[PDB]
Amino acid sequence: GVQVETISPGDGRTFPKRGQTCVVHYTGMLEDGKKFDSSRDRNKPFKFVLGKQEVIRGWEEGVAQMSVGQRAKLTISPDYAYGATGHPGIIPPNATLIFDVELLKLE
Numbered sequence: 891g892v893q894v895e896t897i898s899p900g901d902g903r904t905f906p907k908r909g910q911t912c913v914v915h916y917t918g919m920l921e922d923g924k925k926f927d928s929s930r931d932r933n934k935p936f937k938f939v940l941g942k943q944e945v946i947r948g949w950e951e952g953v954a955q956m957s958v959g960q961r962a963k964l965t966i967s968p969d970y971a972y973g974a975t976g977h978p979g980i981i982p983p984n985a986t987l988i989f990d991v992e993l994l995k996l997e
């Protein structure tokens with residue numbers, strides 16, 4: 891599944907609803923592995939609509955329990971991420987992923 895561990899607390903009040911646009915900064919890495927992406931390096935926040943299956947399952951269920959301002963470590967098992975196929979050319983089969991995610995605001 892996805893384990894959410896808090897790095898910095900959010901407001902504890904404003905949680906995303908399905909259909910809202912979530913605005914975040916993230917860094918992704920393979921568990922005990924290489925870092926493969928970071929929006930911080932580009933300083934362009936990443937945006938996605940919650941509930942529409944635009945992103946992997948671990949983000950759908952992990953960010954839905956975060957409040958605005960929260961920063962958290964999400965550890966996501968292969969079946970909540972790219973599973974047995976991986977993501978062509980970047981993520982191998984059966985990879986556990988770790989993301990540092992900061993929920994900046996909702997739109």
Ligand SMILES: CO[C@H]1C[C@@H]2CC[C@@H](C)[C@@](O)(O2)C(=O)C(=O)N2CCCC[C@H]2C(=O)O[C@H]([C@H](C)C[C@@H]2CC[C@@H](O)[C@H](OC)C2)CC(=O)[C@H](C)/C=C(\C)[C@@H](O)[C@@H](OC)C(=O)[C@H](C)C[C@H](C)/C=C/C=C/C=C/1C
Binds near residue numbers: 927947949977980
């Ligand atoms: C250049 O950087 C990429 C992001 C890269 C891709 C490679 C991976 C290692 C990675 O580095 O991100 C990464 O760190 C990662 O694993 N991410 C991105 C952050 C959210 C979590 C995860 C993910 O789910 O990626 C996603 C993953 C790779 C594929 C999806 C996983 C879930 C599944 O349900 C989807 O099928 C529908 C496919 C990529 C995304 O977050 C982007 C936003 C979404 C898509 C491309 C699809 O949902 C697409 O459907 C056709 C859409 O409906 C979109 C909105 C349509 C518009 C025009 C296209 C936007 C494209 C922007 C893409 C961006 C910024």
